[PDB]
Structure formats: C-alpha cells, structure tokens
Design goal:
It is found in: Nucleus. Belongs to the nuclear hormone receptor family. NR1 subfamily. The chain has a single domain (1-233), classed as Retinoid X Receptor, CATH 1.10.565. Helices cover 63% and strands 4% of the residues. It is built from 9 helices and 3 strands; from the N terminus they run αααααβββαααα. The protein has helices at 3-20, 25-30, 38-46, 49-72, 82-100, 130-146, 150-161, 172-193, 205-223, and strands spanning 105-106, 111-114, 117-119. Strands 1-2-3 form a 3-stranded antiparallel β-sheet. Helix 1 (3-20) packs across helix 8 (172-193), helix 5 (82-100) runs antiparallel to helix 7 and helix 6 packs antiparallel against helix 9. The protein is globular. The two termini are 34 Å apart. Bound molecules: the ligand OC(c1ccc(-c2ccc(CN3CCN(Cc4ccncc4)CC3)cc2)c(F)c1)(C(F)(F)F)C(F)(F)F. The ligand OC(c1ccc(-c2ccc(CN3CCN(Cc4ccncc4)CC3)cc2)c(F)c1)(C(F)(F)F)C(F)(F)F binds next to helix 4, helix 5, strand 2, helix 6 and helix 9.
Length: 233
C-alpha cells in the first residue's frame, strides 16, 4: 500500500459517494429555513399509519437504492461473489442510510428533510413509533455534533458496508483485505485533514447495528400487510 495507492482509494471512494449521494449538500443547507407549518404537521399527523408507513417505505427504499449504487462503485466490491455482495448490503445498507441521514438533519431545531421540507419527529406520530423515531433523531443529533464532512461520511460509510465480520460471507479473506485497505485510506485521510480526533467520538458499530435491527423488525411487521412498488435509478 503505497501513498499514491492509498490516496487513489481515498479519492475513488469520495468520487463514488459524490455520484451516489442522493441529495446535494448545498440544497439540504439552503432548505433549512423551509420548515413544515403547524398546519402541515397536523396534516401528516392525521394520516393513517398505513399511508405514513408507505411514504416512509418509499423514502427509505429510494435511499437504499443509492447506497447500493455506492457499494457497486467501491473498488473491489463488484469482484466479490454475488453471495457476498448480497450479505454485505443486507447487513449494512440500512445502517448507511441512517448515517447519511445526518446530512439532512438540522441540530438547531431538531428537524429532518422529509418530502420537501424540514420537520421535527412529531411529524411521524401516526406511525406510533415515538421511541424508535426519537432514537433515530438522537443518533443523527450525535453525528451532527461531530461536523462530519462529506469525505468523512464517504469513507466511514464505506467501512460500514465493507465489514469482514458479517456472518454468511464466502470469501472472508477478500473482504478483510478490502476492509483493511479502506481503513488505511480512512485513517490516512483523517491525518491529512487534521481530524484524528473523530475516531474516538464515532459511535460504536453496535449502536448503529442495534438501531437498525429495531428498525427492520418494525419494517417487516409493516410490510407484512402493506406492500408497495417503487421507482429506480
Ligand atoms: O422503522 C420505522 C421508520 C419510519 C420512518 C423513518 C424515517 C424516514 C425518513 C427520514 C428523513 N430522511 C432520513 C434519510 N435521509 C437519507 C439521505 C440523507 C442525506 N443524503 C442522502 C440520503 C433522507 C431524510 C427519517 C426517518 C425511519 F427511519 C424508520 C418506524 F420506526 F416507524 F417503525 C418504520 F419503517 F417501521 F416505519
């Protein structure tokens, strides 16, 4: 692993992120003042859990599609067998969506960009999932305090996906090598940018993991009775 190779991996991972980040940072920021009105919030709260579930399902399905496209552009991911690609994505795609979410989160007023405007967590009341929604807002509140840059999100979410400890992998050594390469790139870039300090402030991978298991359990109990077909890209 030469300096030139490490830096090419850095630049490469950051390019794939730039091409598959669903929402441009500039828009998210300039729309921070565009907040749902009290009447609009009441409108979301009056919807049935079934309508709200299908709006969130569509929103999450779309975001997962971008995370999948992100993975496919990661050096070496496509050279993995189909089984390992699926294992990695099934275990990590929703964790990455939760990480990316902090870009759309405004720590000042505790609102998130959702269907065109910023709203607090009371927007999702109809789902009857206050505790879980609150946990998701707290998680992205923590990441916002770190001031995650776009390249830190790119490199960190690459490491969420490329994890040689996911059970079910058939080529563990090949994933281990990809993982260590990405760890090198991530650590090298933090040094270049003077951001060593965030390693210890990052959440433990078990925090993100537990958050997504509670997520998917409610996810399946919802889709068990209300399926939907979404678009592509
Ligand atoms: O698990 C449940 C659940 C219900 C709703 C959300 C949910 C949906 C949307 C948002 C706002 N988004 C976050 C993702 N961000 C992606 C992104 C960000 C930045 N750049 C590119 C892409 C766009 C903004 C927040 C939360 C959820 F996460 C889980 C429940 F808890 F209710 F049970 C379910 F499904 F069962 F209903």
């Amino acid at each position: 692993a030469s300096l030139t190779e490490i830096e090419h991996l850095v630049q490469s991972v950051c390019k794939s992120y730039r091409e598959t980040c669903q929402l441009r940072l500039e828009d998210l920021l300039r729309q921070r003042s565009n907040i749902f009105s009290r009447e609009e919030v009441t409108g979301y709260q009056r919807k049935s859990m079934w309508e709200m579930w299908e709006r969130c399902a569509h929103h999450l399905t779309e975001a997962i599609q971008y995370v999948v496209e992100f993975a496919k552009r990661l050096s070496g991911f496509m050279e993995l067998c189909q089984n390992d690609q699926i294992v990695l994505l099934k275990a990590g795609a929703m964790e990455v969506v939760l990480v990316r979410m902090c870009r759309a989160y405004n720590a000042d007023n505790r609102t998130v960009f959702f269907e065109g405007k910023y709203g607090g967590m009371e927007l999702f009341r109809a789902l009857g999932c206050s505790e879980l929604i609150s946990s998701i807002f707290d998680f992205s509140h923590s990441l916002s305090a770190l001031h995650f840059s776009e390249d830190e999100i790119a490199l960190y979410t690459a490491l969420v996906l490329i994890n040689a400890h996911r059970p079910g992998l058939q080529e563990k050594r090949k994933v281990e090598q990809l993982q260590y390469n990405l760890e090198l790139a991530f650590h090298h870039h933090l040094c270049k940018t003077h951001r060593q300090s965030i390693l210890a402030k990052l959440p433990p991978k078990g925090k993100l993991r537990s958050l997504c298991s509670q997520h998917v359990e409610r996810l399946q109990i919802f889709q068990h009775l209300h399926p939907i077909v979404v678009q592509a890209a």
